[PDB]
């Protein structure tokens, strides 16, 4: 067989790569972690260094407190018994306050308060992490596309957990922290809003989610197909088009009649992905605020 370049045949290693400096405060980088020959068959073998300034510490601490809060509730539900905790793991659930409390913070700990504490910590963890994505880009002189992309994911999450509950008048509308309980929530949400397949924004969100799989299979396959000419060196193919970039375009021109460039395919990419959650969040936000029943709505609007 031709070698297909999914796994490497030979690994080479050199001194740990401590990274570019540009404007980064080096006092906040760790040393390098270990090298993993296991990862190195597929990607880079090197772990670390990681940058952890104050916003990183904040984000991690908060993320851990989100997790500790949920886990405390789970162990309690398990009667402090480890066997039960493992047995029933996917069944435990930290549930928001009852409708009766609206948007207040008056609910007892065992019945809503703990949920708010958990959400509080999640909110801090995510937004400070969002800040990290901007700031690490800025220190390296780079564009802010990652932070802008991450924001599209934040959008769905904010809508589900915070914006839509606030607009509906109660925390009882937010999502519970539990593996099965959150799946039950999702299912119920569709039923109660007359079936999300009738929400055109849900349909679009699916188009994009499937489309992202289509597109990354296309793109990943294409780059690997032209790796025998250095295709994965995309930045330098952008700066100085090579026969990798030309064979890649012409594959697609000849197949489907049009094609991308090495830079441009990344723009099709970022947008296919980001529109999953952008359209998704619109779809959800409209549900029960403006549209109670997508079936019904669809009968009156095409």
């Amino acid at each position: 067989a031709e070698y297909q370049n999914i796994f490497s045949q030979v690994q080479v290693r050199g001194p740990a790569d401590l990274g570019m400096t540009e404007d980064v405060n080096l006092a906040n980088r760790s040393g390098v972690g270990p090298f993993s020959t296991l990862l190195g068959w597929f990607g880079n073998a090197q772990l670390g260094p990681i940058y952890l300034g104050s916003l990183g510490v904040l984000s991690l601490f908060s993320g851990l407190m989100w997790f500790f809060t949920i886990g405390i509730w789970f162990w309690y539900q398990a009667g402090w018994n480890p066997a039960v905790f493992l047995r029933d793991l996917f069944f435990f659930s930290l549930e928001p306050p009852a409708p009766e409390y609206g948007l207040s913070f008056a609910a007892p700990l065992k019945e809503g308060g703990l949920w708010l504490i958990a959400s509080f910590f999640m909110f801090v963890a995510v937004w400070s992490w969002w800040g990290r994505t901007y700031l690490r880009a800025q220190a390296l002189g780079m564009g802010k596309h990652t932070a802008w992309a991450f924001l599209s994911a934040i959008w769905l999450w904010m809508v589900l957990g915070f914006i839509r509950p606030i607009l509906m008048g109660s925390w009882s509308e937010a999502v519970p922290y539990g593996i099965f309980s959150h799946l039950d929530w999702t299912n119920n949400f569709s039923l109660v809003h007359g079936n999300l397949f009738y929400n055109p924004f849900h349909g679009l969100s699916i188009a994009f989610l499937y489309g992202s799989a289509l597109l990354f299979a296309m793109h990943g396959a294409t780059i690997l197909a032209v790796s025998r000419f250095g295709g994965e060196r995309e930045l330098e193919q952008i700066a100085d088009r090579g026969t990798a970039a030309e064979r890649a375009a012409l594959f697609w021109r000849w197949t489907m009649g049009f094609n991308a460039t090495m830079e441009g395919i990344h723009r099709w990419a970022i947008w296919m992905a980001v529109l999953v959650t952008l359209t998704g969040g619109i779809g959800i936000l409209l549900s029960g605020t403006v549209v109670d029943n997508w079936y019904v709505w669809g009968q009156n609007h095409g």
Binding site: Q77, R132, F197, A213, T222, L224
Partner: protein, 281 residues
């Protein structure tokens, strides 16, 4: 018309069938024997769909729907009006997809590139064939396939899922979803990453792949690298489709009860089955 750099690559050769008989282009499109096969299968397909439309009595594309034979037909043939057309259109569809994959192989051979693209595509085709061919055959009837209609196929998704309760509880389906959501996460990151390096802050020099590794290591403590990430996207998206095919091939065949109840095997392991407390005691 050609791209500015295209002519040097439009040489003879690479065909799998027909020698040079079909070694040519129409505009940008490569033809080949598989281009002719594709056109034939697609064209016949669309014509049969259109005729089906006429027997439904509509031309609205939001209403046109071609349904497989009813379950009573088993795996036999059915009259055209009542399932036959679906069976023919499925054969045309399959023919067109495989012809498309094989045309892609011819294009690779002419271009001197690897075969990764049509190989990837073959996963999509196998997903399709699981729903319209393999699953219905194992379940004993074409009527278990989905119908070809913009909205009617969505009805089929929903009826098929609710046959087994909340379909969320299918474990292969959970894995499949994980791969889909992870794939889209990976696609956002990769696109943003390359663009952030190609389009730095105003007035600054393009960054380097080294800057891209640095960004990720600074952020999460790890960078998969530029080969890595293309390997990853391909793996994530192909795995998402493999697990999709899997999650349906087992449904109605090896498992056909409510998917939530499958999870009782774990809960009822003997060492903790009867320990009191928790949700299940």
């Amino acid at each position: 018309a050609l791209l500015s750099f295209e002519r040097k690559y439009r040489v003879p050769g690479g065909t799998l069938v027909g020698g040079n008989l079909f070694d040519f282009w129409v505009g940008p499109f490569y033809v080949g024997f598989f281009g002719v096969a594709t056109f034939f299968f697609a064209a016949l397909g669309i014509i049969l769909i259109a005729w089906s439309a006429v027997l439904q009595g509509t031309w609205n594309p939001q209403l046109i729907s071609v349904y497989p034979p009813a379950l009573e037909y088993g795996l036999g043939g059915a009259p055209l009006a009542k399932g036959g057309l679906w069976q023919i259109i499925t054969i045309c569809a399959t023919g067109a997809f495989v012809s498309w994959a094989l045309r892609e192989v011819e294009i690779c051979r002419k271009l001197g590139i690897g075969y990764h693209i049509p190989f990837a595509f073959a996963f999509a085709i196998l997903a399709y064939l699981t729903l319209v061919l393999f699953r219905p055959v194992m379940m004993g009837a074409w009527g278990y396939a989905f119908p070809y209609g913009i909205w009617t196929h969505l009805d089929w998704v929903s009826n098929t899922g609710y046959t087994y309760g909340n379909f969320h509880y299918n474990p292969a389906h959970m894995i499949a979803i994980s791969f889909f959501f992870t794939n889209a996460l990976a696609l956002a990151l990769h696109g943003a990453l390359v663009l952030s390096a190609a389009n730095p802050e105003k007035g600054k020099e393009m960054r380097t792949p080294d800057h891209e590794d640095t960004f990720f290591r600074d952020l999460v403590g790890y960078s998969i690298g530029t080969l890595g990430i293309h390997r990853l996207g391909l793996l994530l998206s192909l795995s998402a489709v493999f697990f999709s095919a899997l999650c349906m091939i087992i449904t109605g065949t090896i498992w056909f009860d409510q998917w939530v109840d499958w999870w009782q095997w774990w809960v009822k392991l003997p060492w903790w089955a009867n320990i009191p407390g928790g949700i299940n005691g």
